[PDB]
Amino acid sequence: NAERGDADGGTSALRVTREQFHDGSRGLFRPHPFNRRFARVRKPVFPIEARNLRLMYKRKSKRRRGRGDKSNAKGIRWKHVHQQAGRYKGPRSRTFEGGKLPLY
Amino acid sequence: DIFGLPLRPDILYRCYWFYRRAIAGWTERMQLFKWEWPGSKRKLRTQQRSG
Amino acid sequence: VDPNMTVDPPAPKPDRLLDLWANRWLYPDELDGIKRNESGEPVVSEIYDGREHQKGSYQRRGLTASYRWYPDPQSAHWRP
Amino acid sequence: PLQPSFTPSVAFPAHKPVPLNSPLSPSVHAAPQVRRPGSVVRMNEVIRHWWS
Amino acid sequence: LPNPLVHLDISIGGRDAGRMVFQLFADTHPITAENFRCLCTGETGLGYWMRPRWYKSTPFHRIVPGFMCQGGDIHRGDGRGGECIYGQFFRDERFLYKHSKRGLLSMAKARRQHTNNSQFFITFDACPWLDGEHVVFGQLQSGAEVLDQIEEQGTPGGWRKRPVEIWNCGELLLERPEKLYEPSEQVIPIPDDVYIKARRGF
Amino acid sequence: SHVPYKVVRTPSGNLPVYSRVRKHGTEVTTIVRHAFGDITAMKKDLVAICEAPVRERLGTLEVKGLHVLKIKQWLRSLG
Amino acid sequence: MASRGGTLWHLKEVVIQYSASGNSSQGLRFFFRHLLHRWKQRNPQVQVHTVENKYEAPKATFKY
Amino acid sequence: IADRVRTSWTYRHSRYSGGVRFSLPRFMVTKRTYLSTKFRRPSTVTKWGNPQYTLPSNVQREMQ
Amino acid sequence: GTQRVVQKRRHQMRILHPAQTAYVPVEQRPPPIPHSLTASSTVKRLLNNNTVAAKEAAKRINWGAYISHQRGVRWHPQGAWRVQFSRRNHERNFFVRCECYFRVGTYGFQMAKDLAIRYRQRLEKEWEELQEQWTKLDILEAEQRAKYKEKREEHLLL
Amino acid sequence: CNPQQTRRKQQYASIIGKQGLSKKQCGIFWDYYKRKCKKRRSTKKFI
RNA sequence: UGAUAUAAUUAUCGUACAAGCACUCAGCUAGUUAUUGAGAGACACUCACGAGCCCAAAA
RNA sequence: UUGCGUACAUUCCUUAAUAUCUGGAACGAUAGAUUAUGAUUAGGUAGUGGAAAAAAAAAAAAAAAAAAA
RNA sequence: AUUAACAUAACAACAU
RNA sequence: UUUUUUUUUU
């Protein structure tokens, strides 16, 4: 059972060999997934090696300031124009409130 | 329970990298600062009478 | 230019509907696997005739005899 | 075509399950099978489920 | 309920021509019928331009003998105008009836699809080629002698020999053309009232 | 059994199901751990039962909303 | 393309340089086994040649 | 990957980001040196790329 | 070290907790309402408005008509029946993506449904047949290859 | 951070993909090319 | 030959324009770092275990 | 009286959508080939977010691949 | 031996 | 050695 070929052009009880993998000598070429050489996708999963290990998820990239105008970096103009140039950006304190007494 | 577990490359990634980073140890790659060099402190060109 | 010309036939009925949505027309070799009834027509025809579902559909794929537009009263397609 | 020179080889339909009795059944209810280093089940399911 | 019975008084060159009477198909075309009846009665007030939405004192900008005669413009009266009670433009309606009778009424259209307005036209003869492109909502019941006189003022180029304007309008208080297909009942899951109710908060 | 999947109990004798709160108490979901077998059908079942979306994470099954109790009782019936 | 009533083609020769060990050439390699033979038959008017190169990226040259 | 960007709650994972769709028109532009046509067009080619002649028909026929 | 204290709420001398429901076993689960319906405005407002008029309208609304007992056939907010059939084949270089639509304004609510059903049913069989032909094609190819190899060996023997 | 690096990379790329290059030929890239070749030869080594 | 067109950059309410730098090219040169921090209604990724988690320095 | 010139169509063809709600909770699945009348769309300083690239170095995976040789 | 800026030369052009 | 440890429970 589960070994016939039931071919087109009517009916035919042609026996076939059920094989997951083949060399194409007697059918369709079915290479094993255990080979990067024979892989169709650039990023395989199953083949284990030092050069294949993946996170399975996109990783955050670096973003350096002052690298082109078109870049997705943070603001550069605000930091320079509309900002206190004192190397502290304010009083060297922790409870400053703008003249008025702190909360505490 | 040892030899019959799902294949998890994700875990292996970390596990692999751990050892590699460990192996590194301490690198001597260093660069000098402006003050670390041997030099003076005085100016070179005063503002007056020289554009 | 023949004044005794006749109106173009209606839209054709393709044998296979997969080619309409596929990226390439089936080759002659592949078309050999088409089941047919005693009448000679595809067996599949019983389920569905295969008529046009939308205005100016087959024309887009070029299955029509000739190309026509709004100016042509013989034409039938979507208009903005 | 009717009488080829060799027995053709064809795999099970990927759009359908496999009998449990078959060694190539990754289902949980698969029957016991004595395997050896190098034995691989039908990857159709295994690749899709790389963690389960 | 009984269908509306509107009337129009035409004046050719300042002379009282007569009084034509039309019957609107409210049963089949409620919206369309309603539009025309409201415009004729002038019971809606002003409009977009602060103008009264009334067919009174409107010229016919097109008179083609044996084909049709256009008119209804309230803004300019030339043809590049129109305004419905609903607004500028309104959606079309099912194409049930054909154009195979003398005196049939039908709305006009612009280059675009949905450009229906107050602008209508009366057909003088059968127009098969117009089938499906226009909505039929009215039929002449009496006063063909006025349409016959109006036909004389047309030219092949659509020119006008003498002024043609509607003097008075109003509504009277007290066989159909062919059909394109056979109407049949349909499944209406969502009630009509719901659509109205949705636009107000509910 | 009539299920293509099974669940493994904790050492302590508890089901692998918990809750999850994120974004200062504004995203409450449930977490399912230790899932084997045909998970594709499991997701269908879960979604059907819970009337809520299901996300397939990297080795964990998340379901929108708090359904811990429901999940637990569902699992207990299957065994 | 067709010319003079479809009695004259433009495309003459096609050379394809690929590798037998590079991973980037996987696609080419695959192509060379399934669709190459099928493609050739359909276009008998065009010559096709292949060049093996290990330490070189794949490419294709076309002659008209 | 996929057809479009999925904004649904079902697809909000880090594993769904990245990738690029194939495009023939764009493939012949991306990563390709630009070449100007100025001072390069032959005499046999019109402004619109159409074929051009450089000899009277009479002469052409005589020398054919 | 450091302490991480969580916030809590009080109400009637009771700790407020999120809503939770138990499990109710069911022998047979009925089909769900298509999600596509929500893509319109009439239902969107209905859902977004918690009022007696909405709750009454809900009752009146017939939800059972939009349910389709056929894979590949779905409702669309455009007022149509969408037919979906997507398949890929790299080996044979064949990719199909059906995007057929059956408009209501052209045929009708039931007619369109029926038609769509029929179309999907047809496509299934078509695909089946194509696959069956591809297998024999493959076989044939194999045979030709073997004969060519034998012919090649003949020349070496000569 | 300049035009010079582009020239060096283009030059390098033009010679990297070859075999049987002499020291006099390689130039400044001799070390790199030798390391590349030795790296490549690693695959042919068996137990 | 016909038609058409106010170098570039920063600040500024203001293309502000008769304000500031630059003849040109080559080399160098301005957001570096969590064994110590983090999700706080102007935006915060992901893995493992689970009512339990981590284990410091010797080694 | 009747006229006419004029700025802007996503009619045609080719792309794009990452702060949980565009159908999509669909289909397919061995790892996605881009929806043919499909709805909203795509001017932008400051600020914020997503994605593709930068020819190099390291890794003990650079020959199970048709035909030809 | 060596890139650019910079310096000189040769050839190429006709509906003018 | 640090942190966490339901306010519900027929």
PDB file of all heavy atoms in Angstrom, chain I residues 135-158:
ATOM      1  N   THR I 135       4.658  15.378 -12.889  1.00  0.00           N
ATOM      2  CA  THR I 135       5.320  14.137 -12.484  1.00  0.00           C
ATOM      3  C   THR I 135       5.748  13.300 -13.688  1.00  0.00           C
ATOM      4  O   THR I 135       6.902  12.880 -13.781  1.00  0.00           O
ATOM      5  CB  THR I 135       4.423  13.310 -11.583  1.00  0.00           C
ATOM      6  OG1 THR I 135       3.203  13.005 -12.213  1.00  0.00           O
ATOM      7  CG2 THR I 135       4.148  14.011 -10.266  1.00  0.00           C
ATOM      8  N   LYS I 136       4.846  13.076 -14.651  1.00  0.00           N
ATOM      9  CA  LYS I 136       5.172  12.315 -15.852  1.00  0.00           C
ATOM     10  C   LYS I 136       6.253  12.991 -16.666  1.00  0.00           C
ATOM     11  O   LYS I 136       7.124  12.320 -17.204  1.00  0.00           O
ATOM     12  CB  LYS I 136       3.902  12.106 -16.674  1.00  0.00           C
ATOM     13  CG  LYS I 136       4.179  11.613 -18.100  1.00  0.00           C
ATOM     14  CD  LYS I 136       2.881  11.223 -18.800  1.00  0.00           C
ATOM     15  CE  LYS I 136       3.095  11.003 -20.292  1.00  0.00           C
ATOM     16  NZ  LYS I 136       1.810  10.725 -20.979  1.00  0.00           N
ATOM     17  N   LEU I 137       6.257  14.294 -16.779  1.00  0.00           N
ATOM     18  CA  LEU I 137       7.260  15.057 -17.420  1.00  0.00           C
ATOM     19  C   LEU I 137       8.630  14.778 -16.849  1.00  0.00           C
ATOM     20  O   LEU I 137       9.612  14.538 -17.569  1.00  0.00           O
ATOM     21  CB  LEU I 137       6.927  16.480 -17.568  1.00  0.00           C
ATOM     22  CG  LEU I 137       5.866  16.987 -18.453  1.00  0.00           C
ATOM     23  CD1 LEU I 137       5.456  18.315 -18.201  1.00  0.00           C
ATOM     24  CD2 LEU I 137       6.170  16.755 -19.814  1.00  0.00           C
ATOM     25  N   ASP I 138       8.768  14.797 -15.563  1.00  0.00           N
ATOM     26  CA  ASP I 138       9.939  14.497 -14.831  1.00  0.00           C
ATOM     27  C   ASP I 138      10.465  13.122 -15.154  1.00  0.00           C
ATOM     28  O   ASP I 138      11.659  12.902 -15.416  1.00  0.00           O
ATOM     29  CB  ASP I 138       9.830  14.798 -13.400  1.00  0.00           C
ATOM     30  CG  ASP I 138       9.526  16.175 -12.976  1.00  0.00           C
ATOM     31  OD1 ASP I 138       9.736  17.067 -13.826  1.00  0.00           O
ATOM     32  OD2 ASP I 138       9.073  16.414 -11.836  1.00  0.00           O
ATOM     33  N   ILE I 139       9.627  12.136 -15.134  1.00  0.00           N
ATOM     34  CA  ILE I 139       9.916  10.784 -15.439  1.00  0.00           C
ATOM     35  C   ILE I 139      10.511  10.654 -16.822  1.00  0.00           C
ATOM     36  O   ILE I 139      11.530   9.985 -17.063  1.00  0.00           O
ATOM     37  CB  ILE I 139       8.833   9.781 -15.143  1.00  0.00           C
ATOM     38  CG1 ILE I 139       8.437   9.654 -13.733  1.00  0.00           C
ATOM     39  CG2 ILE I 139       9.075   8.517 -15.733  1.00  0.00           C
ATOM     40  CD1 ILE I 139       7.182   9.195 -13.385  1.00  0.00           C
ATOM     41  N   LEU I 140       9.908  11.256 -17.796  1.00  0.00           N
ATOM     42  CA  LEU I 140      10.319  11.304 -19.148  1.00  0.00           C
ATOM     43  C   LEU I 140      11.710  11.870 -19.291  1.00  0.00           C
ATOM     44  O   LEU I 140      12.573  11.350 -20.014  1.00  0.00           O
ATOM     45  CB  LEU I 140       9.314  11.881 -20.050  1.00  0.00           C
ATOM     46  CG  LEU I 140       7.999  11.275 -20.311  1.00  0.00           C
ATOM     47  CD1 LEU I 140       7.005  12.170 -20.767  1.00  0.00           C
ATOM     48  CD2 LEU I 140       8.106  10.117 -21.117  1.00  0.00           C
ATOM     49  N   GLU I 141      11.991  12.953 -18.642  1.00  0.00           N
ATOM     50  CA  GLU I 141      13.250  13.593 -18.578  1.00  0.00           C
ATOM     51  C   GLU I 141      14.328  12.657 -18.092  1.00  0.00           C
ATOM     52  O   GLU I 141      15.426  12.552 -18.657  1.00  0.00           O
ATOM     53  CB  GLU I 141      13.223  14.902 -17.917  1.00  0.00           C
ATOM     54  CG  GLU I 141      12.599  16.068 -18.474  1.00  0.00           C
ATOM     55  CD  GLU I 141      12.727  17.377 -17.813  1.00  0.00           C
ATOM     56  OE1 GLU I 141      13.073  17.350 -16.613  1.00  0.00           O
ATOM     57  OE2 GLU I 141      12.517  18.438 -18.438  1.00  0.00           O
ATOM     58  N   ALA I 142      14.086  11.956 -17.031  1.00  0.00           N
ATOM     59  CA  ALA I 142      14.930  10.976 -16.462  1.00  0.00           C
ATOM     60  C   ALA I 142      15.300   9.898 -17.451  1.00  0.00           C
ATOM     61  O   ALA I 142      16.473   9.525 -17.619  1.00  0.00           O
ATOM     62  CB  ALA I 142      14.478  10.436 -15.229  1.00  0.00           C
ATOM     63  N   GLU I 143      14.322   9.353 -18.127  1.00  0.00           N
ATOM     64  CA  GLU I 143      14.503   8.355 -19.137  1.00  0.00           C
ATOM     65  C   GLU I 143      15.416   8.839 -20.243  1.00  0.00           C
ATOM     66  O   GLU I 143      16.342   8.140 -20.688  1.00  0.00           O
ATOM     67  CB  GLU I 143      13.236   7.797 -19.691  1.00  0.00           C
ATOM     68  CG  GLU I 143      13.326   6.568 -20.496  1.00  0.00           C
ATOM     69  CD  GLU I 143      13.586   5.320 -19.724  1.00  0.00           C
ATOM     70  OE1 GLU I 143      13.598   5.412 -18.479  1.00  0.00           O
ATOM     71  OE2 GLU I 143      13.781   4.243 -20.327  1.00  0.00           O
ATOM     72  N   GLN I 144      15.153  10.060 -20.719  1.00  0.00           N
ATOM     73  CA  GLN I 144      15.982  10.625 -21.779  1.00  0.00           C
ATOM     74  C   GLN I 144      17.431  10.762 -21.331  1.00  0.00           C
ATOM     75  O   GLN I 144      18.357  10.463 -22.098  1.00  0.00           O
ATOM     76  CB  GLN I 144      15.427  11.981 -22.217  1.00  0.00           C
ATOM     77  CG  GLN I 144      14.163  11.891 -23.054  1.00  0.00           C
ATOM     78  CD  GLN I 144      13.598  13.254 -23.400  1.00  0.00           C
ATOM     79  OE1 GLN I 144      14.206  14.283 -23.104  1.00  0.00           O
ATOM     80  NE2 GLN I 144      12.431  13.270 -24.032  1.00  0.00           N
ATOM     81  N   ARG I 145      17.704  11.195 -20.143  1.00  0.00           N
ATOM     82  CA  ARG I 145      18.988  11.311 -19.563  1.00  0.00           C
ATOM     83  C   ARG I 145      19.720   9.993 -19.546  1.00  0.00           C
ATOM     84  O   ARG I 145      20.901   9.883 -19.905  1.00  0.00           O
ATOM     85  CB  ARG I 145      19.012  12.046 -18.294  1.00  0.00           C
ATOM     86  CG  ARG I 145      18.802  13.460 -18.190  1.00  0.00           C
ATOM     87  CD  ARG I 145      19.178  14.101 -16.971  1.00  0.00           C
ATOM     88  NE  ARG I 145      18.525  13.670 -15.835  1.00  0.00           N
ATOM     89  CZ  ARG I 145      17.337  13.952 -15.407  1.00  0.00           C
ATOM     90  NH1 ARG I 145      16.670  14.768 -16.029  1.00  0.00           N
ATOM     91  NH2 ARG I 145      16.863  13.431 -14.401  1.00  0.00           N
ATOM     92  N   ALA I 146      19.015   8.954 -19.093  1.00  0.00           N
ATOM     93  CA  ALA I 146      19.628   7.627 -19.052  1.00  0.00           C
ATOM     94  C   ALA I 146      20.029   7.161 -20.448  1.00  0.00           C
ATOM     95  O   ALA I 146      21.138   6.636 -20.648  1.00  0.00           O
ATOM     96  CB  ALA I 146      18.671   6.626 -18.406  1.00  0.00           C
ATOM     97  N   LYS I 147      19.143   7.348 -21.431  1.00  0.00           N
ATOM     98  CA  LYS I 147      19.480   6.943 -22.794  1.00  0.00           C
ATOM     99  C   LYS I 147      20.679   7.724 -23.319  1.00  0.00           C
ATOM    100  O   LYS I 147      21.549   7.159 -23.997  1.00  0.00           O
ATOM    101  CB  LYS I 147      18.274   7.120 -23.715  1.00  0.00           C
ATOM    102  CG  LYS I 147      17.260   5.995 -23.614  1.00  0.00           C
ATOM    103  CD  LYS I 147      15.977   6.324 -24.355  1.00  0.00           C
ATOM    104  CE  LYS I 147      14.899   5.290 -24.079  1.00  0.00           C
ATOM    105  NZ  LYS I 147      13.602   5.650 -24.711  1.00  0.00           N
ATOM    106  N   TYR I 148      20.745   9.024 -23.022  1.00  0.00           N
ATOM    107  CA  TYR I 148      21.889   9.813 -23.468  1.00  0.00           C
ATOM    108  C   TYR I 148      23.184   9.311 -22.842  1.00  0.00           C
ATOM    109  O   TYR I 148      24.225   9.269 -23.508  1.00  0.00           O
ATOM    110  CB  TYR I 148      21.679  11.291 -23.142  1.00  0.00           C
ATOM    111  CG  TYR I 148      22.732  12.191 -23.750  1.00  0.00           C
ATOM    112  CD1 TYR I 148      22.632  12.621 -25.066  1.00  0.00           C
ATOM    113  CD2 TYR I 148      23.833  12.603 -23.009  1.00  0.00           C
ATOM    114  CE1 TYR I 148      23.594  13.440 -25.626  1.00  0.00           C
ATOM    115  CE2 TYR I 148      24.800  13.422 -23.561  1.00  0.00           C
ATOM    116  CZ  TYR I 148      24.677  13.838 -24.870  1.00  0.00           C
ATOM    117  OH  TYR I 148      25.636  14.652 -25.424  1.00  0.00           O
ATOM    118  N   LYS I 149      23.147   8.938 -21.561  1.00  0.00           N
ATOM    119  CA  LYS I 149      24.351   8.402 -20.928  1.00  0.00           C
ATOM    120  C   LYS I 149      24.797   7.107 -21.598  1.00  0.00           C
ATOM    121  O   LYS I 149      25.997   6.900 -21.834  1.00  0.00           O
ATOM    122  CB  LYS I 149      24.109   8.172 -19.436  1.00  0.00           C
ATOM    123  CG  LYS I 149      25.380   7.876 -18.653  1.00  0.00           C
ATOM    124  CD  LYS I 149      25.083   7.512 -17.208  1.00  0.00           C
ATOM    125  CE  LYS I 149      26.341   7.061 -16.481  1.00  0.00           C
ATOM    126  NZ  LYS I 149      26.047   6.543 -15.117  1.00  0.00           N
ATOM    127  N   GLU I 150      23.848   6.219 -21.908  1.00  0.00           N
ATOM    128  CA  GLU I 150      24.218   4.984 -22.595  1.00  0.00           C
ATOM    129  C   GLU I 150      24.840   5.279 -23.956  1.00  0.00           C
ATOM    130  O   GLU I 150      25.855   4.673 -24.336  1.00  0.00           O
ATOM    131  CB  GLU I 150      22.997   4.077 -22.747  1.00  0.00           C
ATOM    132  CG  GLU I 150      22.546   3.426 -21.450  1.00  0.00           C
ATOM    133  CD  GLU I 150      21.226   2.695 -21.594  1.00  0.00           C
ATOM    134  OE1 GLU I 150      20.934   2.210 -22.707  1.00  0.00           O
ATOM    135  OE2 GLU I 150      20.482   2.605 -20.595  1.00  0.00           O
ATOM    136  N   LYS I 151      24.253   6.218 -24.704  1.00  0.00           N
ATOM    137  CA  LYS I 151      24.831   6.581 -25.993  1.00  0.00           C
ATOM    138  C   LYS I 151      26.236   7.148 -25.836  1.00  0.00           C
ATOM    139  O   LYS I 151      27.116   6.849 -26.652  1.00  0.00           O
ATOM    140  CB  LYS I 151      23.932   7.583 -26.715  1.00  0.00           C
ATOM    141  CG  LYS I 151      22.719   6.948 -27.372  1.00  0.00           C
ATOM    142  CD  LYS I 151      21.715   7.993 -27.824  1.00  0.00           C
ATOM    143  CE  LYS I 151      20.462   7.347 -28.388  1.00  0.00           C
ATOM    144  NZ  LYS I 151      19.472   8.357 -28.850  1.00  0.00           N
ATOM    145  N   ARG I 152      26.469   7.961 -24.803  1.00  0.00           N
ATOM    146  CA  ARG I 152      27.814   8.475 -24.567  1.00  0.00           C
ATOM    147  C   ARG I 152      28.797   7.340 -24.313  1.00  0.00           C
ATOM    148  O   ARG I 152      29.905   7.337 -24.860  1.00  0.00           O
ATOM    149  CB  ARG I 152      27.816   9.446 -23.386  1.00  0.00           C
ATOM    150  CG  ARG I 152      29.135  10.196 -23.220  1.00  0.00           C
ATOM    151  CD  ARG I 152      29.269  10.812 -21.838  1.00  0.00           C
ATOM    152  NE  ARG I 152      30.622  11.301 -21.597  1.00  0.00           N
ATOM    153  CZ  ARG I 152      31.167  11.453 -20.397  1.00  0.00           C
ATOM    154  NH1 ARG I 152      30.500  11.165 -19.291  1.00  0.00           N
ATOM    155  NH2 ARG I 152      32.415  11.906 -20.303  1.00  0.00           N
ATOM    156  N   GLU I 153      28.410   6.367 -23.482  1.00  0.00           N
ATOM    157  CA  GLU I 153      29.303   5.239 -23.225  1.00  0.00           C
ATOM    158  C   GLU I 153      29.585   4.447 -24.497  1.00  0.00           C
ATOM    159  O   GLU I 153      30.673   3.867 -24.642  1.00  0.00           O
ATOM    160  CB  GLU I 153      28.709   4.323 -22.155  1.00  0.00           C
ATOM    161  CG  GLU I 153      28.740   4.905 -20.753  1.00  0.00           C
ATOM    162  CD  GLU I 153      28.471   3.863 -19.687  1.00  0.00           C
ATOM    163  OE1 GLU I 153      29.164   2.824 -19.681  1.00  0.00           O
ATOM    164  OE2 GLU I 153      27.565   4.080 -18.855  1.00  0.00           O
ATOM    165  N   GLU I 154      28.622   4.404 -25.420  1.00  0.00           N
ATOM    166  CA  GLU I 154      28.846   3.683 -26.671  1.00  0.00           C
ATOM    167  C   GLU I 154      30.038   4.254 -27.433  1.00  0.00           C
ATOM    168  O   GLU I 154      30.866   3.500 -27.959  1.00  0.00           O
ATOM    169  CB  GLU I 154      27.590   3.727 -27.540  1.00  0.00           C
ATOM    170  CG  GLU I 154      27.641   2.782 -28.732  1.00  0.00           C
ATOM    171  CD  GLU I 154      26.424   2.906 -29.627  1.00  0.00           C
ATOM    172  OE1 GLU I 154      26.043   4.048 -29.961  1.00  0.00           O
ATOM    173  OE2 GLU I 154      25.849   1.860 -29.998  1.00  0.00           O
ATOM    174  N   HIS I 155      30.142   5.584 -27.509  1.00  0.00           N
ATOM    175  CA  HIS I 155      31.259   6.193 -28.223  1.00  0.00           C
ATOM    176  C   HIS I 155      32.594   5.855 -27.572  1.00  0.00           C
ATOM    177  O   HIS I 155      33.566   5.563 -28.275  1.00  0.00           O
ATOM    178  CB  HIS I 155      31.081   7.709 -28.298  1.00  0.00           C
ATOM    179  CG  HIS I 155      31.826   8.349 -29.428  1.00  0.00           C
ATOM    180  ND1 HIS I 155      33.132   8.028 -29.736  1.00  0.00           N
ATOM    181  CD2 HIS I 155      31.450   9.291 -30.326  1.00  0.00           C
ATOM    182  CE1 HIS I 155      33.527   8.745 -30.773  1.00  0.00           C
ATOM    183  NE2 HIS I 155      32.526   9.519 -31.149  1.00  0.00           N
ATOM    184  N   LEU I 156      32.663   5.889 -26.239  1.00  0.00           N
ATOM    185  CA  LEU I 156      33.896   5.500 -25.564  1.00  0.00           C
ATOM    186  C   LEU I 156      34.261   4.060 -25.890  1.00  0.00           C
ATOM    187  O   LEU I 156      35.434   3.749 -26.129  1.00  0.00           O
ATOM    188  CB  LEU I 156      33.761   5.686 -24.054  1.00  0.00           C
ATOM    189  CG  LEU I 156      34.179   7.054 -23.515  1.00  0.00           C
ATOM    190  CD1 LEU I 156      33.121   8.103 -23.817  1.00  0.00           C
ATOM    191  CD2 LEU I 156      34.454   6.974 -22.019  1.00  0.00           C
ATOM    192  N   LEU I 157      33.272   3.163 -25.905  1.00  0.00           N
ATOM    193  CA  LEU I 157      33.568   1.781 -26.277  1.00  0.00           C
ATOM    194  C   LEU I 157      34.079   1.682 -27.709  1.00  0.00           C
ATOM    195  O   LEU I 157      35.013   0.916 -27.977  1.00  0.00           O
ATOM    196  CB  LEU I 157      32.336   0.897 -26.093  1.00  0.00           C
ATOM    197  CG  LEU I 157      32.377   0.039 -24.828  1.00  0.00           C
ATOM    198  CD1 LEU I 157      32.199   0.899 -23.586  1.00  0.00           C
ATOM    199  CD2 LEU I 157      31.331  -1.062 -24.885  1.00  0.00           C
ATOM    200  N   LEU I 158      33.493   2.433 -28.636  1.00  0.00           N
ATOM    201  CA  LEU I 158      33.967   2.431 -30.018  1.00  0.00           C
ATOM    202  C   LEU I 158      35.424   2.874 -30.084  1.00  0.00           C
ATOM    203  O   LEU I 158      36.144   2.539 -31.024  1.00  0.00           O
ATOM    204  CB  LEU I 158      33.102   3.343 -30.894  1.00  0.00           C
ATOM    205  CG  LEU I 158      33.501   3.416 -32.371  1.00  0.00           C
ATOM    206  CD1 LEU I 158      33.416   2.046 -33.031  1.00  0.00           C
ATOM    207  CD2 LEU I 158      32.634   4.423 -33.113  1.00  0.00           C
TER     208      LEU I 158
END
